[PDB]
Symmetry: C3
Subunit: 195 residues, 3 copies
Amino acid sequence: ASFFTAAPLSYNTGNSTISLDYRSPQLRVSGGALALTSPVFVYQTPFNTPMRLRNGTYNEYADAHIQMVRFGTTVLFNIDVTGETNATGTQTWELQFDGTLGSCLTGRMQVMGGTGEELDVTPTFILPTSDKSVYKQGFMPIVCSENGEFKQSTYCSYALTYRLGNFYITLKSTTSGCKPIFQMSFMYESQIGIV
Amino acid sequence: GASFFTAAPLSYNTGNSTISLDYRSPQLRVSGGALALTSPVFVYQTPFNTPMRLRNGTYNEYADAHIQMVRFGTTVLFNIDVTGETNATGTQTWELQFDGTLGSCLTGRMQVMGGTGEELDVTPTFILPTSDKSVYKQGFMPIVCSENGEFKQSTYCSYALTYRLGNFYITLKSTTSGCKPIFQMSFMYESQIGIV
Amino acid sequence: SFFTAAPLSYNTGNSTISLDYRSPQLRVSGGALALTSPVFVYQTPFNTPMRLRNGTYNEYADAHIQMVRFGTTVLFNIDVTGETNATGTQTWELQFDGTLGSCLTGRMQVMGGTGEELDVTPTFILPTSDKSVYKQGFMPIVCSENGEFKQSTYCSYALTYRLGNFYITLKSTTSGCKPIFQMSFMYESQIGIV
Ligand SMILES: [Hg+2]
Ligand SMILES: [Hg+2]
Ligand SMILES: [Hg+2]
């Protein structure tokens, strides 16, 4: 009565209630707190902290920077591999995630905000299908290189699967004489909604 | 003065007795008196496990397509995951048709999906380039035809955005030779239509 | 003698009205509401491509450029289109201020989803505030013309600092085709939007 509300705040004299007006397609209320409808979350390898990946059961290794960007219900997966050995024929890199929480078991990953800071969010938003019966494989063209010099044009396979209640992303690069040094990216869908 | 206080981001001004929300204008804004984002993310996509059936020109070759169209800022990221059963030979033409005023996919069912998983009641105009119909964005993208998780071909896929008869078209021209049309591809384009 | 509807809350202990928000998605920044992971796009303006020169040659190209910040990731996308038929490798170079991020090569703007220009210093496009280690790489591309296939080939990218300025240097290798291609890559920005 003896105060007013500037938009987006509103007062209703009928029920004596102060409210926040918001556009529902962009923002929403979640357990009584304001949230976004389509927030951006990134589960990534930390700054300057690549993950060490093993080629199958061999004692061949590579350093990987990984970003997993959630927008809407899409996950954009991006990996920047860099091995020191000149590999074999096909090589198999495997990321393993907890099937309930999404936490990377293979190596250290963090939910990072735009502030730079680590967010206290369980990374379930990277999991496809809450039901563990997922299909999705595919190929992507890549370029093996070294010291900023072109080596090969070739391809990289990807596959998403569940085994023993754990989510796997399995990449199959096919080099021949070159080292496994390449960036690749793909998109997939997460049925798990962000609450 | 007042018999109450305001924690940030709420503020009280004792001069005009008014409660406000303080917000950073580059990130948030007010739109018809309601709070909104400056650069919201919207996705117009094929529904979960509900691919769209596309036909290759007038031929009896078909393909199932999952499609995502992600709006950030004024950029649209278009992603398609095709999978055909016939082995095509030569170039094949897949064509998506959208309403030129509303953006609604006429070719098959698509929905605006939020990050919650829920369908949003939003007209998909945010996927339209150039308000009113003189667009000429085309390009090529390299792809990999495959089958049963086994490598077939490295090849290319053309894309073109056009208007015809007040309708927005996205036309993809994959050039396989012996392989089935099975590939993911993605490109970015601009939408002049602001989300205001 | 008033109530608060969620997400507004009243605490009778300290007589204080608050906004409840989920901290992973929203936050307070100098007392104002903001996003945790806002989307910012530093781009060439609508219908305003940037004119790029191939080294010291009198060969030019028009480039549309988007630099999309999500979290701490920058997605870089360029759509080049030249009129000359180059032969051999060609070098396109984008130059940005190393402290502010402002494109020195040509006009770029922070554009919101509304279409409007945002008054934001484009520091969010800068990788590593003190030079460091990463981001040279290659990406496969397709040279074309008039919507007709020319070449499958490759494009190099490199992020470097020289004289306190951030450079993005693309090295397309055509051999008779015009330089007409889209390419995109991702990199990390240590500079937090705070
Ligand atoms: Hg690979
Ligand atoms: Hg195609
Ligand atoms: Hg290039």
